[PDB]
Structure formats: structure tokens, C-alpha cells
Structure 1
Amino acid sequence: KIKIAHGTTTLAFRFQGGIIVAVDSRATAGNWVASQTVKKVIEINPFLLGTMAGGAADCQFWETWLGSQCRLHELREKERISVAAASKILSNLVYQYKGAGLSMGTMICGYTRKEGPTIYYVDSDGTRLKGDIFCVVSGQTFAYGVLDSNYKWDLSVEDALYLGKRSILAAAHRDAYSGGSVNLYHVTEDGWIYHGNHDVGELFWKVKEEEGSFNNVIG
């Protein structure tokens, strides 16, 4: 298609230490790899993160707009907007446009003291869902977390980051359209913290050597 679309590798999960957000950085037009360095996490504001799945433009434009609407709310009400309220601004907007051809599957992630760590999955269909974990792998959204479904609520921030990084690596290897690098975010009550850009090429060899996993692959 003309419009860059992302059907794969966005993960967001809730844990003791807040929310982990993990994405890949690959953009594909058909089988052509357009880029290995795209940002699939949209920084709406210092406390709100959005994941880009579906139309790249549709996600960028309307989640940048959501940050504008969130800023207005804070000027008018002199209070941080709740994740419930921020998610519902975007969900109600895409519902107006329903049937026009907007494509968006996004996890709105925020940590407020009213709600605690909150993830909302927002759809171009007008679906708005609160959940502990959401993942998007090759145009398919799942609420289970790529690897073991259980994982841990009582998980260290270091360990939770690794699980998210390792989860993107699992998808990046198997999924043709997933790859490039992993971008890691830790969402706390005081805001989100960037946990860097990790090349999947270098990550894969290191993980394989240290975990002993990917025995099937020769390196």
C-alpha cells in the first residue's frame, strides 16, 4: 500500500513496578523493508505512551492530537488527565471516523495515583479495553504476552524490562515484518523512562549465547 502500516511487534504489560512497553522498529511496504529505525512508541506526554500498530500516520497524527487534548484538560482542570479519560478522547474520536478507513490498534499506557498503572487497547473499530497485557504480532492482537502467559506480577523492573525485550526478540526472529531494534519504556507514576534502543542482530546472538535458546539457529 501507499500508507506505511505496522501489524507487528508492540507489547505493553502491567506489573508491580508500573508498565513495560516494548516495540520493534521495522517498517515494511509489502516485502520491501522501508526502515529498520521507526519509533512505534508515541510519547503523547511525559506520563502517557502510545503504541503504533495499523496506519503509521493515523497513529502518529491522532496520538500527537491526544497529547494536545490532554494538555488542554490539564490547563482547564488543573489536574493530570486519567488514562481512562485520555484513552476515551482517542476512542471517541476514531468512532466518529468509523467506516472511513482509519487503521489503528494502540495501547494507551499511563500511571496515575487515582487508577495506578493502566493500559487501554484502542481500536479503529471503536473498541476500548482495559487489560494487564496486550501484544500485536503480524496483524493480530493478543492479551497473553508472546511467551509464557503467567509471567509475574511480583517482577523486578530489570527483569520486567528483559521479559519485554526478550518477547520482541521472539517475535522479531519468527515474524518477517518484525525486526530492526527493540525500544524499551518503563512507565511510573512520576512519568515514563526510556530504556534505550537494542539492535535485534546483536541482541539475538548475545541472548542465544547467554540463555542457550535458539539452539536450532547456528552461530
Structure 2
Amino acid sequence: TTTLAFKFRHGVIVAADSRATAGAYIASQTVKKVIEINPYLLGTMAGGAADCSFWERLLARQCRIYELRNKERISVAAASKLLANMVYQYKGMGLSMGTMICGWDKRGPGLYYVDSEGNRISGATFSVGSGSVYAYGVLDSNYKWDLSVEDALYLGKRSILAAAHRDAYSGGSVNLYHVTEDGWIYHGNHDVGELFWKVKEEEGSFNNVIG
């Protein structure tokens, strides 16, 4: 996998590839690694597909009962912490999860990294997965706070592409999301095969590759 997310002026961008692997064998290439917890909350998946899917779906149900008892949408911090405490019970037992809880709440846009090891970190920029290391190069070099929605969406898309190209266990297609205070907005599924050639021509990058 490659997944990323970052805070900025106009909310938070969330992007991810779609490849699923079983050794060298590419089992699927149509996997949704972004889970919609509520119209204002997203969750990313990396590592154990089954683990990430189960626990984040179970979290979405915790976040919903919260809204019913409290007449109030759960905060990003509280949601991230419920997950963290849930997976902490099974620590050392074999769980493999690398997630980011992205959303907009009362404190503005929120972004937390949560994993099966026990980490829970608030931050403006994250990337988790086998291809995260490639994505960080593009993010760190081009990331501002004063970024337009159009340019921010492109950055997250271009970052996954960088990783999808180099990392053997990343690719397929890019799923984009933009989270505002009026909720998240899906910005499509983009095949890396087609996207790569397009970006190569328009941007001039990947000069080493022939096409």
C-alpha cells in the first residue's frame, strides 16, 4: 500500500492507491482503502486488509452511538482514541493496521495517525504504507498551508503516483477525497496506467521512462 493525508487551509486531502497483494501475486486492484465513517469522517487502511476493515467499521458504529446519546458528532481526537484503545487490547497478538483518521470538527480540520503498535499522533501531514517513503518526497517539497483545493488535490494524487511507480506493492488506481466543514467530497478513481502517461506529458516528469 500507499496512503496519504494532509491538513491545509481549505480542509484535509486524503489519497490512496487500490492494490492488494498476496506475496508477489496481485490479488486485487480495486480496493477501497478509504472508509467513510460519517459524512465528516474518513479512515485510511494499510497493512492487514481484514484487520483494517473490521476495526474501522466497528469504530464507525461506536461513532454513531456517540451521536445518538450525545446529540453531537464525535470529534476527530475522540474517534482516533477509541480506535487506539480498541487495538491496544490486542497488542502483541498479531494485528497489522496503519490508519489515518481524517475529518473536520469544532477545532477545525483534524488528522490523526493510529497504528496497531500503539501510536496515536496528531499531525498536518502523514503517509503510511510500503510506498509512503516515496510519497513523502513529493509532499514535503511542495506542501504549503496556503494551497488551493485544485493544487492540493493534484499534490495528493501526484504523490501516490510517485509511490505507485517505484513501489512494486503499490498501484492500480488513485482514490481522492477532500474533507470540508460541510463534509467530505469524493474526487474520483484514477487509473495509474492512464494517469502516469498523462502526467509524464503535461508535467514533463519521468523522463527516464519511454512513451
TM-score strictly above 0.5: yes
For residue 69 of structure 1, the aligned residue among 33, 37, 62 is 62
TM (norm. structure 2) is: 0.96
Identity %: 79
Corresponding position of 2:15: 22
Find out whether 1:91 has 2:84 as its counterpart.
yes
Whether the aligned pair in 1 keeps the contact of 2:77 and 2:112 (CA below 8 Å) is: yes
Question: CA separation in 1, counterparts of 2:165 and 2:79?
Answer: 34
Question: CA separation in 1, counterparts of 2:42 and 2:199?
Answer: 27
Q: CA deviation at 1:139?
A: 6.9
For residue 49 of structure 2, the aligned residue among 22, 31, 56 is 56
Question: CA separation in 2, counterparts of 1:95 and 1:140?
Answer: 24
Whether the aligned pair in 2 keeps the contact of 1:135 and 1:146 (CA below 8 Å) is: no
Find out whether 1:207 has 2:199 as its counterpart.
yes
Corresponding position of 2:114: 122
Whether the aligned pair in 2 keeps the contact of 1:58 and 1:103 (CA below 8 Å) is: yes
Whether the aligned pair in 1 keeps the contact of 2:101 and 2:114 (CA below 8 Å) is: yes
Question: CA separation in 1, counterparts of 2:77 and 2:130?
Answer: 27
Corresponding position of 1:4: none
Whether the aligned pair in 1 keeps the contact of 2:19 and 2:30 (CA below 8 Å) is: yes
> Higher helix fraction: Structure 1 or Structure 2?
2
Question: CA separation in 1, counterparts of 2:128 and 2:184?
Answer: 21
TM (norm. structure 1) is: 0.92
Find out whether 1:35 has 2:39 as its counterpart.
no
Distance of aligned partners of 1:139 and 1:159 in 2 relative to their CA distance in 1, 3 Å threshold: closer
1:170-193 Cα offsets, whole Å, 9 max, x none, are 000000010100000001111110
Q: Which runs of 4+ in 1 moved over 4 A?
A: 139-142
Question: CA separation in 2, counterparts of 1:210 and 1:140?
Answer: 24
Secondary structure of 1:38's partner? coil
CA RMSD of aligned residues (A): 1.5
Q: CA deviation at 1:146?
A: 3.5
Whether the aligned pair in 2 keeps the contact of 1:185 and 1:194 (CA below 8 Å) is: yes
Corresponding position of 2:166: 174
Q: CA deviation at 1:141?
A: 7.1
Question: CA separation in 1, counterparts of 2:159 and 2:37?
Answer: 24
Q: CA deviation at 1:145?
A: 3.2
Unmatched runs of 5 consecutive residues or more in structure 1: 1-7
